[PDB]
């Protein structure tokens, strides 16, 4: 089916690879060449996840756990029961996430939009690629990746944190947390302002950009404007993921002690050493 205004927009063009061959829709979904590759990697990766569950101890959704190999295998592919299945699924996930980004570019090109969405999603792909590729590769073993399991990856996060005794003291982590918290605040403010001028109390005219700028101005002391709040939201949300990737890649490859003792440089500034 189509939105009442949609049909006019469904032209050919804007593809990156396939030309007209895959330039069609399936229900609501645009396909394209990277749609085909997406569904390939999604299906293969999903069915291998189901196989991992089948050969594991339970079907309980929360307890399924497909673990990476032991560190002794280094950068080789382990036996599939022993973590090689995790390594294949990781390749499928990279293939799927990459295909999804490039498919979004084909869609943006067909609509004459800017490329912002593909790149903003690249911030998440960067963070994933850091956790499963870049950081494991710098540590010299694929076994440093997180396990694929709804709670077992939380056991990994816990243990990686305490590998540095008190992970809250990681300075890039403090920045990343600040971005996540500031983003959620900014999202609530922006959502509230737009809804408050479009849904004023009954018997009140629809509001205006002037009213939301006046309200925003006496909240923060300055008016950010309509383009400004969207630039800020993009900056905060994507900046959180980028600082997240930094905070985890410095932990291990570049810093090995507890994080609290990193702050020794601040105590030793010569003005007060």
């Amino acid at each position: 089916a189509m939105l009442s205004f949609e049909k006019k927009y469904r032209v050919r063009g804007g593809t990156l690879i396939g030309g007209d061959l895959f330039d069609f829709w399936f229900g609501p979904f645009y396909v394209g060449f990277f749609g085909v590759t997406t569904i390939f990697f999604v299906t293969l990766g999903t069915l291998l996840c189901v196989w991992g569950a089948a050969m594991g101890p339970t079907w309980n959704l929360w307890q399924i756990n497909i673990a990476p190999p032991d560190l002794k295998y280094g950068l080789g592919l382990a036996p599939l029961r022993e973590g090689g299945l995790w390594q294949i699924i990781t390749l499928c996930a990279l293939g799927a996430f990459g295909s999804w980004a490039l498919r979004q570019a084909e869609i943006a090109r067909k609509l004459g939009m800017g490329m912002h969405i593909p790149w903003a999603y690249g911030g998440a792909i960067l963070a994933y690629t850091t956790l499963v590729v870049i950081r494991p590769f710098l540590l010299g073993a694929w076994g440093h990746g997180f396990p694929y399991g709804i709670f077992s990856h939380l056991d990994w996060v816990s243990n990686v944190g305490y590998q540095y005794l008190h992970f809250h003291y990681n300075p890039a982590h403090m920045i990343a947390v600040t971005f996540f918290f500031t983003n959620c605040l900014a999202l609530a403010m922006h959502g509230s302002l737009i809804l408050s001028v479009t849904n004023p109390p009954k018997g009140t005219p629809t509001g205006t950009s002037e009213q939301e700028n006046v309200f925003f101005r006496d909240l923060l002391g300055y008016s950010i404007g309509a383009i400004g709040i969207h630039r800020l939201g993009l900056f905060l949300a994507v900046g959180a993921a980028v600082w997240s990737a930094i905070c985890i890649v410095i932990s291990g490859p570049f810093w090995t002690q507890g994080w609290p003792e990193w702050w020794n440089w601040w105590l030793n500034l010569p003005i007060w050493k």
Partner: protein
């Protein structure tokens, strides 16, 4: 029977079919290669009298 190709565009039924077969073939190979009995890269030279067979514990 041939009017199935008036219902569906053959250009993309063939894409969906080939992709399904590729995904299926890769799954079955990775499933077999995960098993002990059919881990053929490591044990393919064993004769059938030497190949692994899984059993439950006796627990007598």
């Amino acid at each position: 029977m041939h009017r199935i190709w008036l219902m569906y565009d053959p250009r993309r039924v063939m894409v969906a079919l080939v992709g399904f077969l590729a995904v299926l073939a890769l799954v079955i190979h990775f499933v077999l290669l995960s098993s002990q009995r059919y881990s053929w890269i490591e044990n393919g030279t064993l004769g059938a009298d030497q190949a692994p067979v899984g059993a439950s514990a006796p627990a007598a």
